[PDB]
Assembly symmetry: D3
Homo-oligomer: 277 residues x 6
């Protein structure tokens, strides 16, 4: 998409950064330009005290139709290994920046999600789809295996049988099927999707943000640990959150529940407006 700075756009609304792939006429294909610009935008939004949540959406009828077969594959193969490695590092680096983002991330998938879009899909903590969205590991249909981690995304989110069929047959899952097999959290009609995402973002914004970061990372990390190692790890993490959370939110919440009896944590969030312990 001619200018690099035009390949991604964003708006800040009510402390949510709404970030969009912005190559609509190229179905939001991941070119090196988009991969560099997406990192730049993610890097500048990450530690803004007024950005609580990042939503990743797409302009036009695609969410993301994968890597750019022209600009990511053909043009880089022409500059040899050096060009291939530079292009790969640009794509992998922004998926990783999104995966470990300081703020909670949400995929808003209204349309086409193919191939190398699976990395960014997985890198979002939560994911909400339109019924009319279509998800495919289309890689087998153009003679390549599902790289950019896409095979691992399918295996880490979906049942083995479902991942195997998805990668071998290159057939598409509807939003409803993507939700049934846990590729995404939920599917709904396209005309309801933005409002649901906005509601989820507004709920996260009400939580202690430090607590949400430590929790979302804990979920990602304890997948790659034994039960017994994860038990000790979660204790170590809470000691870190104790340092990070200057608001001392656990003591604030304990006072509101035990002493004030103004909320029940089983039924709703503590009031982080209040600061008395």
């Amino acid at each position: 998409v001619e200018r690099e700075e035009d390949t991604v756009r964003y708006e800040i609304v009510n402390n949510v950064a709404w970030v969009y792939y912005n190559r609509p006429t190229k179905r939001n294909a991941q070119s090196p330009k988009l991969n560099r610009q997406m990192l730049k935008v993610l890097t500048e939004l990450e530690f803004r005290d007024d950005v609580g949540v990042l939503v990743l959406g797409g302009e036009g009828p695609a969410w993301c139709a994968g890597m750019d077969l022209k600009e990511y594959f053909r043009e880089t193969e022409a500059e040899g290994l050096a060009g291939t490695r530079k292009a790969q590092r640009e794509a992998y680096t922004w998926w990783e920046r999104l995966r470990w983002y300081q703020k909670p991330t949400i995929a808003m998938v209204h349309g086409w999600c193919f191939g190398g879009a699976y990395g960014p899909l997985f890198a979002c903590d939560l994911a909400f789809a339109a019924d009319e969205a279509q998800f495919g590991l289309s890689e087998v249909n153009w003679g390549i295996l599902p790289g950019g981690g896409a095979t691992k995304v399918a295996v880490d989110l979906m049942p083995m049988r479902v991942a195997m069929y998805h990668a071998m047959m290159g057939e598409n899952l509807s939003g409803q099927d993507a939700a049934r097999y846990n590729l995404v959290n939920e599917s709904m009609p396209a005309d309801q999707l933005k409002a649901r995402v906005k509601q989820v973002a507004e709920t996260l914004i009400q939580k202690n943000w430090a607590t949400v970061k430590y929790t979302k990372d804990a979920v990602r990390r304890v997948k790659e640990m034994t039960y017994d190692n994860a038990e000790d790890y979660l204790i170590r993490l809470q000691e870190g959150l104790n340092w990070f959370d200057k608001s001392d939110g656990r003591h604030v919440a304990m006072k509101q529940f035990l002493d004030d009896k103004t909320f029940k944590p089983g039924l709703g969030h503590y009031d982080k407006t209040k600061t008395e312990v």
Copy 2:
């Protein structure tokens, strides 16, 4: 709950130990008193030749509403690190004793199941819920991450997307949702739950008890092994069961199927009354 020995109760009925969290007016919150008494009760029931199955239920409207914010957190923080570590070891030790219990374990979850109740929920081999039960990682709602292993429980039982939403949003799953996402085996109306649990216990009691112990441990252990390592491990385990099972139940069953033709193992259990090989 004033006296330590009153924090847990049990009944033995038809070789099933029905164990209940017994702090109903405190929603069965896990205080250090309950954590010590639960270990004591589990330890004394474990190797009783008349206890075939242990069911973990709760008195009052909660199953278990998590750790006691007053007695487990506030009062122990006041005695410093020493008090915190003593309290943590008491909670972790009984969840582990339950997780590796000599006898099959069943969670009977009729009501509230929150936070640090996830360890005991996972430590039960099987789990049956009331439709009216509510399951939550409420930790984020009082500003802490889901410790006492609860994050790992969510990740080891439920699809990653579901675990992520559950831990970040602190919203509750109904019994039906808890069953759909494999937090529990089944959900049913509260008025049907005890009878279903009683039926499941009576089925396990009819199996070779040594076989059930070796099998339930095998399921837990092979999650943390490669396929190829698990293949050899399962051979090693059967050699152990051969030693442990004095009834020589595999030869008893082989005679009943091959020679007597009185049962078909695909369709029902062998008669462990009979002892001829």
Copy 3:
């Protein structure tokens, strides 16, 4: 089944090897004869340029009712450890040959699938069941734990709760339940099953066969890797596929999509008839 060479049969139809367990009157039980003959048949079909897909079905009312309690267990125990180890190696070796087969594999499960049939069930990449099929870890019902890897199969395919219940209770899953819990891909009436399998095989045959092999192995392998290790591994695999695929199918497909615009990989396979890059 008296002669070893009669324990397995196959037909080649439209480049699909239809292989059948052929001990119908013994419910296709895995005897040492069948284990040796199944390896021999799999070994001779594997690298045939006219075999694109292998389907594993069964003659008679069983798919596979497990190991032969008479010929695999009783008769080998009578020749001691030496006989037991020889028999075990014959069973494990053919399940492994099937699991890593050069060609895509499909389980066509019309009927009984018990115990040590789980290894071959898992060793097939894809699996399609009749509603009337019945799947059981019947091992607990004859006093043994689910060996021949069967416990690991249950844990690698199904949710932990479901695997635990399945192994401890020795109750059977219907085809529909086997599909809901991802033991198989799909369930349908028995009279529709062969046609669905034939359709799936004919779709795989249309893909680049080298691409399908590399992909199906990738799915199996990345389960046993961290996300970050799997990212690099998938790059290494594509470099291998580049060598293996003399048809240079990725460049063929790129031309058809970018230059010719005759297909869209999100919506269907490239035409591997064409050879221009």
Copy 4:
């Protein structure tokens, strides 16, 4: 050793708890009495503000000659599985309490170290031996495999070849050989051993104690992680140490090096007497 409270002794000298196995005439064999008393002593010393280091030594000519063949094995086998499991839990629990101890631990091994003494040997962070000490996995010589984790100790400390020979041949390593193969840190004549241990303890006491705890745990934990997972884990740990260390020792040390230039951390410890940042 008739009274349980006599099976272990300790002295506090210059903030070092010198703990000794105290069954000299039974070569410090681990009986259930000693296993219970060792946990009690470790538990009461752990969080003493005047205990900086714990040294584990032995009275008489043995350090520890393993499990008590009479009181740990024979007498417990006589009370059946229940007695065996109680005895095993008592031994495993104190080795684990020592392995994760709040304070740095040192093994002072002057003499015999056999079998089930390997768990406590490994559970000590550091280990110093007399030339005249003798270390053996003597288990094979009395027909058992090296349990109580001893096989794993040998594999986690020594080269595979050395561990294999040690476990299969049941021959003894001298102190010098134990040091060459990294079973211990150092070996020296018995008459020099206590002074070296005293010197090592006095060096640890001069460090920031919170820093030593976080570091020693980090070493133990990162063995069971991939490089890339360990990188993130070590960041999480430092955030915890930031909370735990009220002395804010990293800022104290930075001032002494950058501003005051009174020490060089490459060459010695910062002065934790000073409190200015």
Copy 5:
């Protein structure tokens, strides 16, 4: 080496099977003929009640100079993938049969040990070298990476730095260096090697053979487990050894130590001649 049955020879002496690679004039290169014959010989010796130990040596100046560049590589590449896979399976299968052998195995390495000889070298439990032996990952010197697992052998036995240098530089280790870096147990002059191996074999033959098998497997297996998983695994293994060991050697040994006081297991093996418990 013209006839397949001539590629391997063996002698039985004092219950030790002395097996030799027998292609001396081809430096004992692993051809498909040798790979098939080595499996056949290993398979027939394994469960002989008069074979306690297997030693793997070589005829002529090589132990094993790796895979046969002519018969294993060139001739099989000429029959395509099918020929390559058949040849690979023959080599891998016998290395694995040796690695998990029922009996203890010893490598007697008097001379050249190169490349694909590392699999068999590692598959032997113990290894003894001549000073004049030379060990090399010569693969880099003929433009291939160290396959047949050789890279993994180097990493599992030697320090990472040593393995890296060994694989990248294709320079040779002397016997003494091979012992210093734990590729083998010991190095000695060639004229002393056979007698040392004979002495080691005669020591293993005096141990309880079932105990040696369970122990040697435990060492190999606990490398691929967390400490805490290995603790439970070793308990499971002893339950298996209890079944396998009809001699009830642990009770025999306990009587000889506790009651008879005729041996000290720290200092020597129990007398397995005696059978009283």
Copy 6:
């Protein structure tokens, strides 16, 4: 070191890129300027057809004295979390670029190597030290745990006991000790070090460069795999090297050994001047 472009220097000599940390008067401390410039230099040298090997040395009396306590820690803490994360990503990213470098890497450590220098030390494939070099995890001496992966470096290279002592005691290893415990490959007098490194580089340059890359990565990767997974992985890697190596060096070498008999791979590298197969 005032200008960013001055913090690193390099020379190309005989196809070796000699790269030096260039803040001699600050003992080559890793400031954000150096971390950015080191990535830039590594990135531009990596795919130069005239760069076969990269050596990492240091100007002045240090190799690398760790992170810059002023510019990496103090100044970034002053810009908050955003500044800390930016600085961490710059350091981690260049250590990783070096660790997976297309070309073989060598650490030339003539002097001080402290703390956060361990990441770059480990990221070099090979390492050669001066006797007068001093290696320390000095972190404990300034009250922090050994981050920037340094703890993991110590555990992945050195015996557990040695790593534990090194991290807890903050005492320094000499070059000779660093070599004995496998932190580096070799130690020699400082006046011999450059010539030895030059000789090692000139040997690597004579090998097939594609072969060296695939091999060095294989060594790093198979540490984090089971034996059985590593066996298959190494086959996959050779298929990749077959694609990457246009020189078809394995067939060139096979001709020189089998047909021409001009070299013996056990004793030296094939002549990659020659191109006939």
